[PDB]
Amino acid sequence: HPTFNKITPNLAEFAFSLYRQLAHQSNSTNIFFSPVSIATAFAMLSLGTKADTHDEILEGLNFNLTEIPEAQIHEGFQELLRTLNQPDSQLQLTTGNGLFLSEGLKLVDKFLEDVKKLYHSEAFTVNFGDTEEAKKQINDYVEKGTQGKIVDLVKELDRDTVFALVNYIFFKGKWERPFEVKDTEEEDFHVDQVTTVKVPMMKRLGMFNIQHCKKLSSWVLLMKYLGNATAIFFLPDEGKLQHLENELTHDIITKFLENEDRRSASLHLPKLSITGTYDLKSVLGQLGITKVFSNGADLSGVTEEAPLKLSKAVHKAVLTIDEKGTEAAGAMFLEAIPM
Amino acid sequence: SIPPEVKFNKPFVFLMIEQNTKSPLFMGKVVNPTQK
Numbered sequence: 001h002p003t004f005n006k007i008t009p010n011l012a013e014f015a016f017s018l019y020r021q022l023a024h025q026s027n028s029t030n031i032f033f034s035p036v037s038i039a040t041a042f043a044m045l046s047l048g049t050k051a052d053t054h055d056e057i058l059e060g061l062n063f064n065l066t067e068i069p070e071a072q073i074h075e076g077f078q079e080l081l082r083t084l085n086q087p088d089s090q091l092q093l094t095t096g097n098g099l100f101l102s103e104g105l106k107l108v109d110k111f112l113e114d115v116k117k118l119y120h121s122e123a124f125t126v127n128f129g130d131t132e133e134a135k136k137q138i139n140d141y142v143e144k145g146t147q148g149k150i151v152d153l154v155k156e157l158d159r160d161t162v163f164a165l166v167n168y169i170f171f172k173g174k175w176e177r178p179f180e181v182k183d184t185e186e187e188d189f190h191v192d193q194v195t196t197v198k199v200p201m202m203k204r205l206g207m208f209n210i211q212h213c214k215k216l217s218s219w220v221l222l223m224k225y226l227g228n229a230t231a232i233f234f235l236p237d238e239g240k241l242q243h244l245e246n247e248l249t250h251d252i253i254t255k256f257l258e259n260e261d262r263r264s265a266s267l268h269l270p271k272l273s274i275t276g277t278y279d280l281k282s283v284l285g286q287l288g289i290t291k292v293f294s295n296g297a298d299l300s301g302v303t304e305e306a307p308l309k310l311s312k313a314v315h316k317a318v319l320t321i322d323e324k325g326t327e328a329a330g331a332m333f334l335e336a337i338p339m
Numbered sequence: 340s341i342p343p344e345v346k347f348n349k350p351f352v353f354l355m356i357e358q359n360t361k362s363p364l365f366m367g368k369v370v371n372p373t374q375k
């Protein structure tokens with residue numbers, strides 16, 4: 001019956017596909033994103049797009065237009081968002097879509113009720129002639145929404161900004177099988193072949209959802225949060241890291257996700273704080289999303305007054321995992337200007 | 340060792356999923372925890 005799982009795949013793949021790009025960049029640095037956050041923003045962006053430029057969005061997100069109709073995509077997206085923004089009693093998970101428009105712009109009323117209904121978006125009128133106050137006004141939304149966890153999303157706002165699209169996501173959960181804190185104890189992590197960093201290592205010995213697949217060449221752990229979520233970790237065999245990344249596929253994940261078999265082991269894993277803060281532009285370029293970002297962009301969907309364009313597509317996420325669960329957050333920032 | 344010892348003492352990828360929808364909430368690779 002449902003809509004999500006009709007798209008869930010396409011997300012999945014996209015995400016992996018996206019990841020593989022980020023990997024190519026540095027082999028030397030943490031990576032964290034929210035494939036959702038990035039993705040819904042571009043989707044409700046595409047709402048106001050026509051021809052080649054709309055097509056490369058939807059498509060670049062791994063959607064195959066012949067196979068699945070346009071209008072269904074959003075119907076999809078509509079659902080996924082609803083579903084997420086339900087109250088899990090034990091788990092807390094939220095997202096939000098915001099539009100911030102300059103006072104002068106007259107929009108295509110359609111497009112407006114479109115984002116208002118399908119992506120349940122929120123609408124704000126601003127003056128982009130007070131760049132520092134506009135800049136604030138946004139950074140609070142994201143601060144409010146991600147409850148403080150992301151606070152400097154927009155570092156430089158362009159003086160001629162005609163509008164911005166923003167979306168956030170916030171995640172706070174707890175393990176089922178939470179670590180005991182008496183246990184946590186500093187060990188080595190072997191980053192590189194010559195770099196060794198001392199880390200707080202949390203520990204339990206007990207019955208875990210863990211296994212090893214010679215396919216992936218890895219160990220795999222699944223770690224349920226209380227509620228409708230789960231963490232998966234993949235420890236690649238020595239030398240097999242790049243392999244691991246290449247093999248990963250959504251249907252493979254789903255296999256793991258059906259399995260509920262426990263095995264006993266002695267588990268050691270770090271406690272973590274990283275962030276990722278990205279300029280998505282070249283990256284979605286590789287993924288063949290060029291035209292919006294260019295002088296060939298078509299956003300007649302949004303307004304008739306002038307030819308706009310995407311100048312900045314900027315994402316940042318933060319994650320913290322400890323003995324008691326995880327808190328994690330992301331947001332996407334999109335700015336449009338005239339030619 | 341018995342039970343066998345599995346240590347995440349090296350770069351590893353992971354990700355989060357929401358069960359209902361199976362959608363990929365966040366995805367990461369941890370190369371150095373101390374770089375923040």
Ligand SMILES: *[C@@H]1O[C@H](CO)[C@@H](O[C@@H]2O[C@H](CO)[C@@H](O[C@@H]3O[C@H](CO[C@H]4O[C@H](CO)[C@@H](O)[C@H](O)[C@@H]4O[C@@H]4O[C@H](CO)[C@@H](O)[C@H](O)[C@H]4NC(C)=O)[C@@H](O)[C@H](O[C@H]4O[C@H](CO)[C@@H](O)[C@H](O)[C@@H]4O)[C@@H]3O)[C@H](O)[C@H]2NC(C)=O)[C@H](O)[C@H]1NC(C)=O
Nearest residue numbers: 026027028029190191192193194195241242350369370371
């Ligand atoms: C990200 O990807 C990287 C690959 O792009 C991965 O890193 C690469 O990993 C190997 C790992 O062993 C490193 O090589 C080590 O070099 C040590 C000696 O260094 C000198 O000699 C080597 C060549 O022999 C050279 O690479 C060094 O840069 C340095 O010499 C320079 O060489 C150039 C070219 O001739 C010359 O012009 C310069 O004058 C010269 N000198 C200087 C000062 O610049 C060795 O001692 C190491 O040996 C150990 O490890 C081996 C692998 O297991 C093992 O077989 C040995 O027995 C021994 O234990 C080692 O050979 C690479 O430098 C490094 N980078 C590159 C670009 O190749 C990286 O791991 C990865 N990171 C991730 C995934 O997180």
Ligand SMILES: *[C@@H]1O[C@H](CO)[C@@H](O[C@@H]2O[C@H](CO)[C@@H](O)[C@H](O)[C@H]2NC(C)=O)[C@H](O)[C@H]1NC(C)=O
Nearest residue numbers: 010055058059060062063064065066067068069
């Ligand atoms: C929609 O998806 C299908 C399946 O991936 C694509 O069709 C296949 O594409 C490859 C590469 O062009 C061909 O070698 C196969 O012969 C295609 N299969 C069939 C049954 O024709 C298809 O290209 C996608 N749609 C569009 C418009 O690109």
Ligand SMILES: *[C@H]1O[C@H](CO)[C@@H](O[C@@H]2O[C@H](CO)[C@@H](O)[C@H](O)[C@H]2NC(C)=O)[C@H](O)[C@H]1NC(C)=O
Nearest residue numbers: 086087088089090091226227228229358359360
């Ligand atoms: C995770 O999501 C499920 C749905 O898969 C939630 O369960 C529904 O909750 C409402 C009350 O909030 C009930 O009326 C429904 O009957 C429940 N089931 C279904 C199939 O809709 C659930 O609350 C969530 N969290 C937890 C902890 O279970």
